[PDB]
Amino acid sequence: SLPLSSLTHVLRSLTPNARGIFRLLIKYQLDNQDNPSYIGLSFQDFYQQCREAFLVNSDLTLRAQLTEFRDHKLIRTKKGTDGVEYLLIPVDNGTLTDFLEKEEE
């Protein structure tokens, strides 16, 4: 797993909204970490959530952003029973927690 400081270093060269996007995805993973049936959010679901937080306004920009995240190994996808891609972050949840506690006091 990637350490907190490498994670921060990747994120600091992105835009404010990209950081928001990543934090929103963290929050979903951490809030559901004790549920073995949570396998992540679909793109359409996450897109709508990002749109409601004024983090993104097009399919295109979100998709570009997730693709950049994947190349940095900050997202992974897993196909559901339905053939739909579900989004998770392949970083230890302790590290992700520490990240949120720094990104606000």
The 8-class DSSP code of residue 14 comes to: S
Three-state DSSP at 37 gives: coil
Q: How far is CA 58 from the centre of its chain?
A: 17
The total of structural domains in the chain comes to 1
Report the distance separating Cα 82 and Cα 4, nearest Å.
Answer: 34
Determine the Cα–Cα distance for residues 37 and 20; give it in Å rounded to an integer: 25
For residue 82 the two structure tokens come to: 């339905």
Q: What Å distances lie between residue 81 and 39, 48, 78, 86, CA to CA?
A: 11, 22, 10, 11
Q: Which parts of the chain are beta strand (E)?
A: 41-42, 76-79, 85-88
Reading the block at residue 85, the tokens are 């891609």
Q: What is the resolution of this structure in A?
A: 2.0
Angle, CA 23 vertex, CA 96 and CA 28 arms, to 5°: 80
Question: Cβ distance 79 to 88 under 8 Å?
Answer: no
Question: Which residue range(s) make up the domain with 50?
Answer: 1-105
